[PDB]
Structures are given as structure tokens and as C-alpha cells.
Amino acid sequence: QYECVAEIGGKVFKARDLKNGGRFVALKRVLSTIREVAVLRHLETFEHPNVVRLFDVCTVKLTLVFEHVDQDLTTYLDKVPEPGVPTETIKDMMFQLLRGLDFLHSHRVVHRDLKPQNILVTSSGQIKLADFGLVTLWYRAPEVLLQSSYATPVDLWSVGCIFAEMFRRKPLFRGSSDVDQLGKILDVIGLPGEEDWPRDVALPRQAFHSAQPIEKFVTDIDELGKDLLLKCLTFNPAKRISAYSALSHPYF
């Protein structure tokens, strides 16, 4: 019922839904596991417009069948004609992003690895999150780098990072390792202040040595866009804005 036409990324393939007009699909071959798939199926019943459709789950290693989207945010940003993405297209794609995120969060599912490669862009220009529910550290939240907490704010830090990248069209924080990554981050937002530093991690606030204008790194950002971007990129997970309240920020 499926013919693998090409490999892409468990490992993701591009097949043809033989029983459904030969349309294209993305087959991923991959107790906790059983539970994770049950959640995926459960989330699918809500058929959210900003989450990739899960057309079916086959057994025999398990293969998940998703709708296939021709491109991701990276490809989209590679092809856009300078000066780049239209300010109103950024605003929209960001809203669609926050929309799917809040959906997942409302259901207590943390994406964990939100990055341009798994944020797909539809033929119609619709954002659809993928690769969740089952390396580059450029989108890792501070707390994850420090191995402190792992709640849902983690995904919002990633959103701030993607948001910046829609303007820059280049990653904001391009670290080479956990420590380098955390280093490049603090150069921008500045040292958090002992009060906001996890009290259980191995890396002391002392292992680093002041904040600077965000507009310097993200040119063309509005005042609202700048407010939102900073609320996302807040060092303390507890003080970081959520997707839900991000959907209500004046920026939108």
C-alpha cells in the first residue's frame, strides 16, 4: 500500500499512497513507545491545521504515515528573494507557529526539538509542525543546555530563535557545543543574575562573563516584534512567555 520513492531523513521516506490516488506521503520507520503513539493518534483526532496530518500507523518496527509537505522553513528561507521575507508573512507564519505550539502545549506535549527543518511550509503557505511526540544546539533553551528543567517553555525559547531567524535568515546562536552554545546566548541577552540560575546544574553562572541591543542582530524588527522576541528569549523558563499568551501579544 506504499512505494518508497525516496529517502529523506527514525528515518523518513517519501512514498505513494497507492490506495489513495498515489498521493505523496512521508513514511517514518521507527510500553512508553506504545503510549507515545497513542498520544500522536489522540492529537490527530483534533486534526489541527498547524500540525502534520497522521494518515495512518502501520505495524509489521513501526511505520508512521504522514501527509507529505514539499518543503520546510529552511528551504523556504533559502529561496526567498531578498530583502527577504515580507514583514507580514513573518507575522503570519509566526502566528501559525504559535498556534500549533499552543495546541501541543494545551495537551501537555513538549516538542523538544523545534527547529526550521521540522517546521514544514505547505503549498498554500501554511505552517505545520512535524517530528514531535517520539545535532544542532542552535535552538536549545538555556535550561536544556544546563540540563536543569525540561518543561514546555523550552519550545518557546526555540520560537524566539526561529523568529529572529526569519529576519536574519541566518541562525542567531550558532554554538558548537553545550557550553559554546550557552556562551553565544549570554553574549546577547546577558548574564541572568544569580537569582535566575538553576541550583542543581554543573555549570556555574561564574563560568561566563552583559546584554546588548537585540535590534543589532535582528534588523527590521518592530517594537512589538522586539518585545515578543525578548519575552520568548527570557533566560528564566518561569518568566518566559507561553504560546497561549504569545498568541495574544500586540505584535499579532
Ligand SMILES: CC(C)c1n[nH]cc1-c1ccnc(NC2CCN(C)CC2)n1
Ligand atoms: C523533518 C522530516 C524529515 C520529518 N520528520 N518527521 C516527519 C517528517 C515529515 C512529515 C511530512 N512531510 C515532511 N516533508 C518534507 C519537508 C522537507 N524536508 C526536507 C523533507 C521532508 N516531513
